[PDB]
């Protein structure tokens, strides 16, 4: 069980991830979203850790932890990251600084300790090798499930925070290995993509909102320690309408309305790869000084004001697979996910949000 | 294998059936169409056989066999009728003339030889009993699958040729017996009928014409000896537009464009009973003299000008059933009118041409 301080940070981490999701969902350039609240919060913790004055105070303020000691922040976030570990979960965090810069010992030790932070130098004078090394580090961290973070780095003169993840929900009741076929996923009413779908009928917590024209299903993960929640509108439509409805309170209402029913869950099968640069969105949440070359004070990090937060790459490979525990209906309700949906990974014990995302366009070709 | 003469007759029989189909499709009174090219050709053959002068020349001209000798047309249509016999298939040809008239020995011998045409004298003024006996003959011929030919016969004074058929395509890959449910078939955009549909996903020869907004599927029959071809527009629309496109040449183009793809075929299940009186339509194709009491010269039939062709009943019971031998699919969902063909694999010979516009069922 989480300590009271880690628990409060977790609540803010969730709220922050909802704000980040909403910010990104408003961008018409953004298709799929994948956010780990904890990893997003740990990134602000590094800014507090490495920074001074306003640069650091903003990070604590975004984290709503301004009344806590710096040690309490780092310890709590450290505890939350540690709590994500409970094969099917892989995380790596690396800070890339220019060749010229030198990371400070104290920072290097603290970041290793609380945030499991790896440190590297990067030379963008040879851009190919610079990209190659980031992408390879991510490939190795996720054992090839995330083969590329970015095709290009916009800002080359600062610090680069890269988080590389691989998550594979392991079901409490597995899908049959043969319950897999090729279907069409409707990205829009006029655009279909060829996907692999996996299928299972079982008793699931389910709710059909006839008023808001949406379905909600809860899929318990291994040993009911966490669960995957799927929110999908009845019709193929842009997620904008549903996203407006999505709040911590609305989710509580929907979940109370759920009941154990026979449900034929059909989901796309495969790895969804998402890379976000959180840089612009975090600045919108109050982290203004850290991302500005002229105002950034990351001097606890390097010893000098020779650094700014150029990027915060949140890169995830989320795998939808048949695997789960062996542990396991005449007229089921269909939860046929062949159109965009919103999903959440919730920790059962804490209520702590592990993932927030949406699948709008899976891998495949047009038809 | 067909003789070269039978093969050329078969090509004319197909072309004739295309002309007949087109003629009928233009008629607003016509709903479902079911034609056996061979049996249709065999009917013109009997008019050539029993009629003389213009009455016979028209019959050959309709069939587009005017450049052939009379014996070539009769012998070759006989071989075609014979080759068909080998899937469930039942045929009966029968000549009904008035009880007073006399069938000529020479014609009786030739009609039974080539066309297997049994002859029967009947009182047509005796309506209920007349109908009862024709409809019973058809019921027995088809083993009750076609219980009725017609509800009425308008011309008591002339000759009646009746063809009674039962055809049941037996699939090379059967439908699962439980893959059957109740759906709605859209006869029009304002009219839906409750039907039973049968469903199967498999590899089928398929073509989707994006330009002409239509789908074409080939469903092989038992041992790939023949196949059932389905032509349907993408959306619910009367078949008129598709029918304009339908030609022997266009069909050849479409079939060459087909390829083996995963197809989810959904078809109405049941027996479709179709009874056509070809009389009016054949007259429109050139067979004018034979159907007219005042111009008909069927003297090779009845030794005198005491006969005319009142009707040519082409009666078929086509059964769509699940029975047959033991990537992301494309939908071929036949819940709206479609055109279909039964083709012989070896010859290319057209066994059936038709369309299902309104299946059995109640309005919903």
């Amino acid at each position: 069980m989480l300590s009271p301080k880690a628990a409060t940070l977790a609540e803010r981490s969730a709220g922050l991830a909802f704000s980040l999701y909403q910010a990104m969902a408003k961008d018409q350039a953004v298709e799929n979203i994948l956010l780990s609240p904890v990893v997003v919060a740990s990134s602000l913790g590094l800014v507090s850790l490495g920074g001074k004055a306003t640069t650091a105070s903003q990070a604590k303020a975004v984290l709503s932890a301004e009344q806590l000691r710096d040690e309490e922040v780092h310890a709590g976030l450290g505890e939350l990251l540690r709590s994500l570990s409970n094969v099917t979960w892989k995380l790596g965090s690396r800070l890339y600084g220019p060749s010229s810069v030198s990371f400070a010992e104290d920072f290097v030790r603290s970041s290793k300790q609380h945030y499991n932070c790896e440190h590297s130098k990067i030379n963008f004078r040879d851009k190919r090798s610079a990209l190659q090394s980031i992408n390879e580090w991510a490939a190795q961290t996720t054992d090839g499930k995330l083969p590329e973070v970015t095709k290009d780095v916009e800002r080359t003169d600062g610090a680069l925070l890269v988080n590389a993840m691989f998550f594979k929900p392991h079901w409490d009741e597995k899908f049959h290995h043969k319950m897999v076929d090729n279907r069409g996923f409707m990205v829009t009413r006029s655009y279909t993509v060829g996907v692999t779908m996996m299928h299972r009928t079982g008793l699931y917590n389910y709710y059909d909102d006839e008023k808001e024209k949406l379905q909600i299903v809860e899929m318990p993960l291994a040993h009911k320690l966490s669960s995957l929640i799927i929110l999908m509108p009845h019709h193929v439509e842009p997620l904008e309408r549903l996203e407006k409805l999505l709040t911590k309170e609305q989710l509580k209402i929907w979940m109370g309305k759920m009941q154990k029913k026979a449900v034929a869950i059909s989901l796309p099968k495969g790895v969804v790869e998402v890379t976000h640069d959180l840089q612009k969105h975090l600045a919108g949440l109050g982290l203004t000084e850290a991302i500005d070359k002229n105002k950034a004070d990351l001097s606890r990090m390097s010893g000098k004001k020779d650094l700014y937060l150029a990027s915060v790459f949140h890169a995830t490979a989320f795998e939808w697979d048949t695997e789960g525990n062996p542990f396991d209906l005449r007229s089921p309700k269909l939860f046929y996910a062949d159109h965009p949906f919103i999903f959440l990974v919730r920790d059962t014990q804490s209520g702590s949000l592990l993932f927030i995302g949406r699948l709008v366009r899976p891998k495949g070709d047009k038809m | 294998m067909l003789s070269p003469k039978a093969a050329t007759l078969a090509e004319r029989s197909a072309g004739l059936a295309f002309s007949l189909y087109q003629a009928m499709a233009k008629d607003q009174a016509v709903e479902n169409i079911l034609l056996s090219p061979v049996v249709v050709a065999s009917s013109l053959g009997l008019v050539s056989l029993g009629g003389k002068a213009t009455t016979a020349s028209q019959a050959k001209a309709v069939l587009s066999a005017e450049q052939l000798r009379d014996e070539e047309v009769h012998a070759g249509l006989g071989e075609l009728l014979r080759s068909l016999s080998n899937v469930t298939w039942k045929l009966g040809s029968r000549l009904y003339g008035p009880s007073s008239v006399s069938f000529a020995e020479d014609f009786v011998r030739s009609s039974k030889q080539h066309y297997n045409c049994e002859h029967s004298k009947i009182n047509f003024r005796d309506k209920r009993s007349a109908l009862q006996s024709i409809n019973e003959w058809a019921a027995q011929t088809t083993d009750g699958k076609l219980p009725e030919v017609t509800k009425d016969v308008e011309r008591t004074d002339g000759a009646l040729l009746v063809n009674a058929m039962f055809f049941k395509p037996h699939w090379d890959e059967k439908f699962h017996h439980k893959m059957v449910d109740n759906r709605g078939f859209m006869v029009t955009r304002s009219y839906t009928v409750g039907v039973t549909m049968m469903h199967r996903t498999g590899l089928y020869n398929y073509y989707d014409d994006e330009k002409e907004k239509l789908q074409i599927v080939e469903m092989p029959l038992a041992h790939k000896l023949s196949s059932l071809i389905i032509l349907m527009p993408h959306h619910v629309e009367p078949l008129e537009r598709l029918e304009k496109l339908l030609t022997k040449e266009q069909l050849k183009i479409w079939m060459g464009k087909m390829q083996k793809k995963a197809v989810a075929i959904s078809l109405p299940k049941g027996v479709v009973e179709v009874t056509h009186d070809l009389q009016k339509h054949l007259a429109g194709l050139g067979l004018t003299e034979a159907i007219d009491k005042n111009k008909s010269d069927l003297s090779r039939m009845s030794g005198k000008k005491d006969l005319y062709l009142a009707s040519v009943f082409h009666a078929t019971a086509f059964e769509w059933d699940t029975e047959g031998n033991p990537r992301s699919p494309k939908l071929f969902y036949a819940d709206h009118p479609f055109i279909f063909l039964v083709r012989d694999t070896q010859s290319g010979s057209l066994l059936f041409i038709g369309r299902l516009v309104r299946p059995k069922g109640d309005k919903m």
Binding site: - | M179, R183, G184, H199, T201, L331
Partner: peptide, 15 residues
């Protein structure tokens, strides 16, 4: 061994 997939769903409603 699992059974085959079921039939396609009914046609959608009009516009």
């Amino acid at each position: 061994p699992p059974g085959p997939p079921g039939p396609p769903g009914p046609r959608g409603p009009p516009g």
